[PDB]
Structure formats: structure tokens, C-alpha cells
């Protein structure tokens, strides 16, 4: 159960920080250059973690001494994967959950999917709850394959879902009738893009905005599937800077799980966000911080500072 | 541009058949069993085709003989060879091929290698492509999908879900640094039985969400000058959704439509969707061909039925 994992871990480390691990090409290139310039300090640190031996793919390459890698076809893979372990290693004591957005692992072909699998293998050993932000949607017969990839192959605890096509697809994502398995998901409700209102707000039904209608139908399906009775849920992606919508959501669905992306290095207001979505069991208000951590040259420092700020706001609210 | 490629292939082969290539694990396993019990007849045909010698990934694995193969690479080998079999058998009937990404991802990286080989193979054959992935994210994030689909795969088009918004199309159908343009089909009315809940029951000013969404997609298309660059944004409209198909062809007369959902009435769809430039009504047929006992014959069949309806609408 994602619910119980979250609950347990939230008790252990007292926070709702979700760390986003979305490495782009410059992150990888910058990491490789800086490891070359500095005796490969961090990769050498990566290699000392017990949990690095338990990843699935190209262990023989990953566990080589950096020095031997340039002495090269496997180099992009090695620095990419090692960048991801580096973030995880530096920041994990501060993160209630990690969220990996699939778009960042696909553009190079398959090599990034290997990286993605290893990252998920690694987080599984560390028992850190995971989310795959992939905003999946298709017909039922088709999405089973996404279910398989995400929950069987990656062993993610949850994923993001776009339910514009409908809520029946959740039957083949959050439930596996053959194996009697249940899975958690966050459906898109109010997103962070500037023009998010065009459909989510400007469409309506019976006097209610589309985002509200969507949220309610998502929970009707969660209830029909008995998810929470099996320690899973369907939650809502609500943008961090959508304060009215977040307020509407926490108000109308008082016990929902919210995943909140949007706060970066140069925007956002953690106090207004966390307050609007607050819940005493604040694993229900996941505050995702991604680039503000992964693009900081001192990622542990970033993850700690965000941790402390959120913690201060949580106590303010208590 | 996708427009040009479509226009030219349509005149060349006289159809709007879109062939779906969505191989499931059972397709792969069965192809493997059937090749093994039949002296690898289809694989031998695969190895005699010009452009298998031109694939990017693990080419010398694919050109080995099953006996050499039969084993970490076994799955890779029969998966890829299944795809190539379907393409070799059916390509002369297809205006376009649509690969659904979901069928290529569930085994990890091995399936993405098959996907790339499939795309490189259809590119050599000069057959127009669609990646059905229904991508959506924020602008800065979807650029990764653009790169993957349009740079790495070299797809002509993909499917997009614009419920988050249409600004995302700016980083999918356009690359401002490179001055490049690409085509997409946005989801308008999909084939799922409950598709009405949002697509029909939500409205703005009386109009159903799907019409609002189609219009906004076309608004963004003009903002990006796709037409002037031989690309477009089109609409996915399910084969089973006649009134909606009718409404779209009626209200947006010259739009491009991709229509999934004809399983195993084609007349009804093609008639409601019809356009004299019939590459504007792509009729997708996947499982009904790929899970037929004789895919080539199944493809010809649908090809001949489509052709007879086209001529009947022309007349």
C-alpha cells in the first residue's frame, strides 16, 4: 500500500517534501565535467553504497572505477545513471517521496530507460516511496501495458494519469483483476501551465468547473475500486501556485491526497501553497521540488533547506 | 512535411488505411512458436529485404540465425522480427503506420530498441508514421518528447492530449531554436465507452468540450504557421463515434482526422469522416490485421473495402 508506506515514512522523517528527479542533458553534461575536474568525488561516493549492487542493468559498467570509463560508448549511461544515484544519495533523508518524470529518461532512446529502471531498483532497496510522473492515458486494453511497465517492471508505488479520456481506464491502472493487485495514482486536476484554465476551469457542468468534476469522478472510481480498503488511493495533481483551486480541493475533498508541483528556484510561495493544501496527515500534501534541488551545485544543501522551510510551515499550521 | 508525404503516398496507393502496429506479449510469443515450428519462414523472408541491413540497433543480432540465437537477445530478436514481418507483409496497403508506444515500453529498454528499428525501417521504406503516445506535460518537459519522437525516431507525427492546454503544442509541433515543424493529432472524441463523461458532458457556452478542444487545437495550429510549413494539427475521433465524426467533418470541413476503433461499421465511419483528399480520414486498423491468421490478406481486405467506399463517395 502506497498509503501506509507514506504514513510510515512521514512518521519517520517528518516532512512532505517530494524530490523531483528530472535530469536534463546539461545536468548530465555538467555532472560529467565536474566529476572529471575533481577526482570523481561523488561517483566514488556512489560506489560505496551497499544498494548499488542490487540494480538490474549493466552493473558491470556502473560499478567500474570512473577512471576506467573514459578509457566510452557506455559513458553517457554511466554519468547519467551516476548523476541520479548521486542526487538520491545526497538528498534521500529529506524526501518523503521521489518523483521521476518519464519524459527526461526517454529522449536518448533506450539507454535512459535502463537508467530509469536502475533508479527505481535503487529506490526500492532504500524503500523510498516512488512516483512515475508520466501522465499516462489510453484505452483500457492499451494502458495495461503502462500498468505492467510502471508497477511490475519498475515496481513504482504510483504514477500520474491524465483521465480526460475517462475514468474507466483507472480500472486497468489502479487495479489488476488477474493478480488481484491494487495500485495508487495521482490524476491531473489543476496543472501549472499558464493556460491551464482553458479547459480545466472554463469548461463546466451543473455549475461546477471541469477540474472539480474530474476530481469527483476520480474519487468515485477509487471508491468503486475499493482502493483505500487496499491501502492505495487515487489522488490529485494540483499546481502549487493555483491557490484558489488547491483551497477548493482540500475543502471539497478534505481527505484527498494532493501532489503539488510548480515551486522552483525563482518562483512560488511555500507558505501559501502548503497552507492551502495542508492536512494534519501531511503526506496528503506532497510538495514537489525538482530543479531547485537537482540544478543546485549543493543538492543536499538545497534538499535540507527546503525540508527545513516546509517543516517550519507544517508547525506553523499544526 | 507530413502533408506532402501523405498527399504523395495517397495518390500512389489510393487508400486511407492506417495500419496499427501494437504487438502484445502473446503476439511475440506466438510468432516465436510459429517460426520455430515452421523453419523460420517469415524470418528468412525478413532477412532477404533490402533495409534490414540498415537498422541502427543490434543489426548483427537480427541477422543471426535463430539457432545461433537460441538468448538474452531472444526476446529482442523475435519481437523485432515480428514487427518487420507485419511491415513487410502489409506495407503496400498502408497509407501510414501507427505504432502505439505503450506496447513497446513494458519490458524496459529492449522494446524501445525495437521501436527505433521499426521507425528506421519505415523511414527507409518512406512510409508515413505516427507515434501514438498521447503525450502531455508542461512545455519545458514535453520538449523531451519532441526530441524523442521527432529527432530520435524521426516520426512524421504523434498523438497528443491537450487537456492541460494548447501552449504545450509550441514545444511539440515547433522547435524555435531549429526552425522545425511537426504534425500531431489531438484527442477530441476517443473510443472508450465512458468517453462522454468529459468530452460530451462538459461544455462552455453550450458547445461540448470536444468541439471546444478541436477549435483551440486549430487556433494553435495557425499561431504556429503549421500549414505554411506542410504540417498540421488534426483530431483523433473514434470510429464508433458517428455523430461526433459527422459534427467534426461538418463543422471543420478540411481538418485532418485519425480514426481508431474499427475492430474485428467501416462504411459508417468513412462516410461520416469522408473527404475527397482522403488522407484527411485516416482509418486505423491494428489488432484486426496483426492478430489475423493472415495479416497480408486481412490488410488487402480492409484495403479493398475502404477503396470501394471511397469510390462510392467520389461518385
The domain that holds A254 is classified in CATH as 3.20.20.70
Neighbours of B147 (CB within 10 A): 18
Residues sharing a CB contact under 8 Å with residue A127, sequence separation 6 or more, in sequence order: A5
CB < 8 Å to B170, chain A: none
In whole angstroms, how large is the CA radius of gyration of chain A?
20
Name the DSSP letter for residue B277.
S
Residues sharing a CB contact under 8 Å with residue A64, sequence separation 6 or more, in sequence order: A78
Flag whether B24 is marked binding. Answer: no
The DSSP string of B186-234 is: EEEE-SSTTTHHHHTT-EETTEEHHHHHHHHHHHHHHHTTTGGGT--EE
In sign, the C-alpha dihedral spanning A145, A148, A150, A151 is positive
The CA distance from B57 to A146, in Å, is 24
Residues sharing a CB contact under 8 Å with residue A300, sequence separation 6 or more, in sequence order: A90, A91
Task: Determine what percent of chain A falls in helix, strand and coil, rounding each to the nearest 5.
Answer: 55, 15, 30
Name the DSSP letter for residue B57.
S
Residues sharing a CB contact under 8 Å with residue A15, sequence separation 6 or more, in sequence order: A94, A95, A96, A282, A307, A310, A311, A314
Picking from B137, B160, B215 by the largest number of A CB atoms within 10 A of its own CB, the best residue to mutate is: B137
Flag whether B98 is marked binding. Answer: yes
Helices (H), strands (E): how many in chain A?
14, 12
- Dihedral (Cα; B213, B219, B220, B225), 10-degree rounding: 150
Task: Determine what percent of chain B falls in helix, strand and coil, rounding each to the nearest 5.
Answer: 55, 15, 30
Written in H, E and C, the secondary structure of B59-112 is HHHHCCCHHHHCCCCHHHHHHHHHHHHHHHHHHHHCCEEEEEHHHCCCCCHHHH
Give the nearest partner residue to B102 out of A109, A142, A194, using CB atoms. Answer: A142
The DSSP string of A257-301 is: -EEE----TTS--HHHHHHHH--SSGGGEEEEE-HHHHTSSSHHH
The CA distance from A137 to B245, in Å, is 21
Neighbours of B168 (CB within 10 A): 27
The CA distance from A154 to B178, in Å, is 35
**A139 neighbors B190 (Cβ within 8 angstroms):** yes
3-state SS, residue B300: helix
- Dihedral (Cα; B155, B161, B166, B172), 10-degree rounding: -20
What Cα–Cα distance (Å) separates residue A28 from each residue in A105, B23, B177? Answer: 12, 33, 21
Number of domains in chain A: 1
3-state SS, residue A102: helix
The DSSP string of A205-225 is: ETTEEHHHHHHHHHHHHHHHT
Q: B202 and A195 in contact by Cβ < 8 A?
A: no
CB < 8 Å to B199, chain A: 164-165
CB < 8 Å to A101, chain B: 137, 141
The CA distance from A238 to A249, in Å, is 8
Q: B213 and A199 in contact by Cβ < 8 A?
A: yes
Residues sharing a CB contact under 8 Å with residue A315, sequence separation 6 or more, in sequence order: none
Q: C-alpha cell of B220?
A: 494553435
What Cα–Cα distance (Å) separates residue A51 from each residue in A56, A88, A90, B10? Answer: 11, 11, 14, 55
Q: C-alpha cell of B189?
A: 472524441
CB < 8 Å to A153, chain B: 106-108
A176's enclosing H/E stretch is strand A175-176
Q: Resolution limit in angstroms?
A: 2.2
In sign, the C-alpha dihedral spanning B21, B25, B26, B32 is positive
The CA distance from A256 to A253, in Å, is 6
**A189 neighbors A165 (Cβ within 8 angstroms):** no
Residue in the block written with cell 570512473: A66
Flag whether B304 is marked binding. Answer: no
Counted across chains A and B, CB pairs separated by less than 8 A come out at 166
The CA distance from A120 to A84, in Å, is 10
Give the domain range for residue B290. 1-315
The CA distance from A267 to B314, in Å, is 57
**A39 neighbors A158 (Cβ within 8 angstroms):** no
Q: B105 and A149 in contact by Cβ < 8 A?
A: yes
**A131 neighbors A259 (Cβ within 8 angstroms):** yes
The alpha-carbon gap from A54 to the nearest alpha carbon of chain B, in Å, equals: 17
| Ramachandran assignment for A206, one of left (phi > 0), alpha (psi -120 to 50 degrees), beta (any other) | left
Residue A144 CA to chain centroid, in angstroms? 20
Q: C-alpha cell of B46?
A: 525478413
Beta bridge partners of A184: A158
The CA distance from B55 to B117, in Å, is 6
**A272 neighbors A279 (Cβ within 8 angstroms):** no
What Cα–Cα distance (Å) separates residue A276 from each residue in A240, A269, B303? Answer: 9, 11, 57
CB < 8 Å to A217, chain B: 197
**A257 neighbors A233 (Cβ within 8 angstroms):** yes
Nearest CA in chain A to B209: A203
The alpha-carbon gap from A117 to the nearest alpha carbon of chain B, in Å, equals: 7
What Cα–Cα distance (Å) separates residue B277 from each residue in B8, B168, B173, B280, B282? Answer: 11, 29, 23, 6, 11
Residues sharing a CB contact under 8 Å with residue A236, sequence separation 6 or more, in sequence order: A186, A187, A188, A189, A190, A215, A218, A249, A253, A256, A257, A258, A259
Residues sharing a CB contact under 8 Å with residue A17, sequence separation 6 or more, in sequence order: A94, A95, A96, A287, A289, A303, A306, A307, A310
**Nearest by Cα to A239 from A194, A180, A292:** A194
Residue in the block written with cell 468517453: B195
Nearest CA in chain A to B149: A107
Amino acid at each position: 500500500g502506497f498509503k501506509v508506506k507514506l504514513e510510515k515514512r512521514r512518521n519517520a522523517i517528518n516532512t512532505c517534501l517530494c524530490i523531483g528527479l528530472d535530469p536534463d542533458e546539461k545536468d548530465i553534461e555538467n555532472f560529467m565535467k565536474n566529476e572529471k575536474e575533481n577526482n570523481y568525488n561523488n561517483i566514488k561516493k556512489n560506489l560505496k553504497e551497499k544498494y548499488i549492487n542490487n540494480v538490474s542493468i549493466k552493473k558491470d559498467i556502473l560499478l567500474k572505477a570512473p577512471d576506467n570509463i573514459i578509457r566510452k560508448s557506455e559513458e553517457f549511461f554511466y554519468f547519467f545513471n551516476h548523476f541520479c544515484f548521486y542526487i538520491i544519495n545526497e538528498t534521500n533523508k529529506y524526501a518523503l517521496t521521489f518523483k521521476m518524470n518519464f519524459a527526461f529518461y526517454i529522449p536518448y532512446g533506450s539507454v535512459g530507460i535502463d537508467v530509469l529502471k536502475n533508479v527505481f531498483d535503487y529506490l526500492y532497496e532504500l524503500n523510498i516511496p516512488t512516483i512515475l510522473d508520466m501522465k499516462i492515458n489510453d484505452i483500457g486494453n492499451t494502458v495495461k501495458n503502462y500498468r505492467k511497465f510502471i508497477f511490475e517492471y519498475l515496481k513504482s508505488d504510483s504514477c500520474t494519469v491524465n483521465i480526460y479520456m475517462g475514468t474507466n481506464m483507472l480500472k486497468d491502472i489502479c487495479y489488476d483483476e488477474e493478480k488481484n493487485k491494487y495500485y495508487s495514482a495521482f490524476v491531473l486536476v489543476k496543472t501549472t501551465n499558464p493556460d491551464s484554465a482553458i479547459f480545466q476551469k472554463n469548461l463546466s457542468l451543473d455549475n461546477k468547473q471541469a477540474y472539480v468534476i474530474m476530481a469527483q469522478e476520480a474519487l468515485n472510481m477509487s471508491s468503486y475500486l475499493n482502493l483505500e480498503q487496499n491501502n492505495e488511493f487515487i489522488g490529485f495533481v494540483v499546481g502549487a501556485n493555483s491557490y484558489d483551486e488547491m483551497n477548493y480541493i482540500r475543502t471539497y475533498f478534505p481527505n484527498c491526497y494532493i501532489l503539488s508541483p510548480g515551486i522552483g528556484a525563482q518562483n512560488g510561495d511555500l507558505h501559501k501553497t502548503l497552507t492551502n493544501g495542508y492536512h494534519k496527515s501531511y503526506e496528503k500534501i506532497l510538495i514537489n521540488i525538482g530543479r531547485a534541488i537537482t540544478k543546485n551545485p549543493y543538492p543536499q544543501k538545497a534538499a535540507q533547506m527546503y525540508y527545513d522551510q516546509i517543516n517550519a510551515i507544517l508547525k506553523q499550521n499544526m
